[PDB]
Design a protein around this nucleic acid. Sequence first.
DNA 1: GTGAC
DNA 2: AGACAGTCTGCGGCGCGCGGGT
DNA 3: GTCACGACTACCCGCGCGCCGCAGACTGTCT
Length: 1010
Amino acid sequence: TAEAPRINPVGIQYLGESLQRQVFGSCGGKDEVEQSDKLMELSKKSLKDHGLWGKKTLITDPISFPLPPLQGRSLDEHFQKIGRFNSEPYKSFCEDKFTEMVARPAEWLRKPGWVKYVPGMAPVEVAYPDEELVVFDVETLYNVSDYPTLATALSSTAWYLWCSPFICGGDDPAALIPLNTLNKEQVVIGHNVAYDRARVLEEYNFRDSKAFFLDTQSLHIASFGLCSRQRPMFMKNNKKKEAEVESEVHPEISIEDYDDPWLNVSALNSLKDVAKFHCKIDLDKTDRDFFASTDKSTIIENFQKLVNYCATDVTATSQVFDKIFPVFLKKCPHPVSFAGLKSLSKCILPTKLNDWNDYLNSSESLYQQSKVQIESKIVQIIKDIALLKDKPDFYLKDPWLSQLDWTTKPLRLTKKGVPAKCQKLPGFPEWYRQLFPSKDTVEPKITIKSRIIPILFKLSWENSPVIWSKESGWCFNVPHEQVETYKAKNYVLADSVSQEEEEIRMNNLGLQCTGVLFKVPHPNGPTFNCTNLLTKSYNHFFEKGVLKSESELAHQALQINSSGSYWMSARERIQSQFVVPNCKFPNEFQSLSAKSSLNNEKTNDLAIIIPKIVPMGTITRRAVENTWLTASNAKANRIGSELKTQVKAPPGYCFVGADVDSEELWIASLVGDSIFNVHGGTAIGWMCLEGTKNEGTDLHTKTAQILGCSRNEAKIFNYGRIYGAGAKFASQLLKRFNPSLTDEETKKIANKLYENTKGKTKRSKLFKKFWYGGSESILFNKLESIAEQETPKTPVLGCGITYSLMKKNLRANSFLPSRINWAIQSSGVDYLHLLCCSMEYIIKKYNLEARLCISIHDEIRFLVSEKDKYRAAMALQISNIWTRAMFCQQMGINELPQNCAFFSQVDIDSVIRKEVNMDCITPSNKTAIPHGEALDINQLLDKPNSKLGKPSLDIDSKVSQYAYNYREPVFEEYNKSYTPEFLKYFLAMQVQSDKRDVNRLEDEYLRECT
DNA sequence: GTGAC
DNA sequence: AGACAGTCTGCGGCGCGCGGGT
DNA sequence: GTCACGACTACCCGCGCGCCGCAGACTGTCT
Ligand SMILES: Nc1ncnc2c1ncn2[C@H]1C[C@H](O)[C@@H](COP(=O)(O)OP(=O)(O)OP(=O)(O)O)O1
Ligand SMILES: [Mg+2]
């Protein structure tokens, strides 16, 4: 009948016979079990200590369907051969690059288009440079338009200059530089090259391009780190540079270089600093103001100077690249890294123009309408208050109005005449004067973020007025009788200095002391001070009634603060995007499919945005985007949060997308389970693999149900406990999730959870310090151990770490937590690169009509026509299973669990959102969007027209030419240092639950070693 | 300052 | 009719709190 | 009954507000 499931000694299911044969081929691991039996016993003991032995898991029928064959006897051979296939011929052009540079022409000619100069010959006019490799730089007049003005290119033989018609006697500034990227394969090298790519004429096509734009900044960051640890490590570099510039003498003996050697191997990200560091070139930056002008006649003069400046920039960039590139080849030697770098350097965003303009208009209009309306009333209140200065008796009794500086200076008199020398407001109180910045200002300025607002809005805490102090922040007065009682409420007294200042101010104003000052609590802790009382996390106190106001505008101010902060943060970046319409370039916007079959109706409003993506902008080799990878999600009360819904597909096309499930937790569990060689050998690995997302039995959901919070808050809590957070911070997090709890309750819960999770600690001379008795002790010990190696490498692809964070460059300020995080956060980049390479290979092999659109970390999307949508989903599933099998085989296990093999959901839609069934109603958008479609593996297999067709025979013939070289895995290199007796005794001690047993094992080891 | 020696 | 020494008067750079994302 | 350093989520982007160091114009004796 049906096939029977296969189960380990632990109740975990594996793949079926067909999937096993097509993925892992034939393998045998029977010989390890004889050594593994002791480990199994240890694992069994651990599983009995936490009560997970004999507990049932999820068992389902096996899945079997045919797959495309592999190109080697192992996954490493397959991936290396496909990487060499996808990396050519750009890799050959990157090498054999010229070293000597040709001479510069004496005079430049002003002529529209492309002009080529060859030493010894006359200048010529050309249509395209038509070169394999060039170095490129672009200049533009940004205050006039977004279109380029001039450009220069350098090759191995000649020089090229491109001039716009706008500076050659024209009134139309809309022009783009042509390079024939749709038919000629080429490599263009530049510094921040995306900004230059955005100004190329033939890049505005839905059909794929054939040019590779390479960036030196990403190579420099990935190689040298730039001390970009986002800690005052970055501050010490600037401080040391300031100290060196201040000193006019250079002593032979150097102080603080012994303590911090890494100060000598770092620079900044700007091109001038990189050139000064690597190539010792002093690059002057003075002419950059000439491109800030409004009149174009300025550019007509000083033409030769500007062209020479741009050519000097080109020369510096070439000399920097010729030194940077071999180092990058040395640190990252796997072809998949280069293929992923090429894949992530080409992205496109199709939009529409009128919708974008309407969205911008509404988003600005609502914001200004709210802001002006509230500010008018605040100014009116200030005007009414400032009129009573003539009666000292009325305001000297008010508890709030008595804290203002009611002092007036005399009017100056010069030679018995009016001086009239910049006197802003004579004979007025000081608090009123400070509102006006200068004499020209006629109306006082005020904002809800000002400091005197809790004085203008009479605020009370526990039915007591608030008092501003110098040393502390906001405080309130409690009489002597109840001082002990409020100590039961865990409030904290202020320091003695503020007490003395309060005493002297009350003696100056002429009253007697009746109590003491208590501090308003702060969310972070008792040490921090409170400075603002109208921000987030004070709304709950306003709802309860602890914070009270005598004015109705406090609640409206809180609403306005909650509603319009993200627009205030991102308006300038959102409104300054470069959008190119269809009506201006009618010969460019070509369709993805060759058989267009006309159908140009109702397509009169189309646009394309090219993002400015830095492929490697972090120490962990992640990509950086300032606008599109920092975009908010749609919310019911947030203005302008519908940004990502503005990306729309043209008629006849759609978006197919996916996102990886529980990514880095799975990687950490795999690292922890690699010691025992069996999936589920540790308690956390067994807890992670028991259920699936579709049944609502994942670890994040269970944590949320136990803690009584949402799933995102559970994700934060779980990712906070790992990477080294304390119990006090966990208690503060629990307080912030549920603000109705008591301090002791949260402390007890956090203490119990940390005791159950991590365990206890032991210090021994032989085995240093180690955790024991917990369900995640082995994982913590392994993560601590792998970060102290001499040459740290990524376990999957073998990428190296930056020079700034290596051991030999550090004697103090170890920066330990980043070195702990680095490997786990850097494995995701390799995951993404493998996924992209697999998708590119499948698309090229089976002639699908698809192209990558956007990749936000572990989320990816593709633009696919209506005919090949389910084939694209199938290719995504195959890529996922290949990547997971690669990860499992590299770490030493030749099996894969069935539950984690495939994506949970695959999304097909027409816009970009997080969930298909979202109306996306915002305060600025009043129209709902129809829902999309989401599919799992069984529903995908049930549908027709989802099967791949006939393949091309020549692709495999081209792939088979490349070579394969065997390499040894990273953990196998790591395991050579330790003797097996040390390992077995350490593993035996890590699973014990009492100090006496560990001491006995240490004594037995000491007796055995002799 | 605080669980471990 | 300058000389110059006090004597204010704003103006710009810097750090920090506070929000968005995986 | 002492003790010896431990202890610490991570990676990115950017704006408004208070604070302080200076460049510049204005009297006022002074020659
Ligand atoms: N506060 C955070 N701290 C550390 N890492 C985080 C944090 N938030 C997100 N990440 C990291 C860990 C994730 O594995 C990785 C991918 O992001 P994300 O998809 O949001 O988490 P996830 O994959 O575990 O949940 P899900 O299964 O719903 O996709 O980014
Ligand atoms: Mg995910």
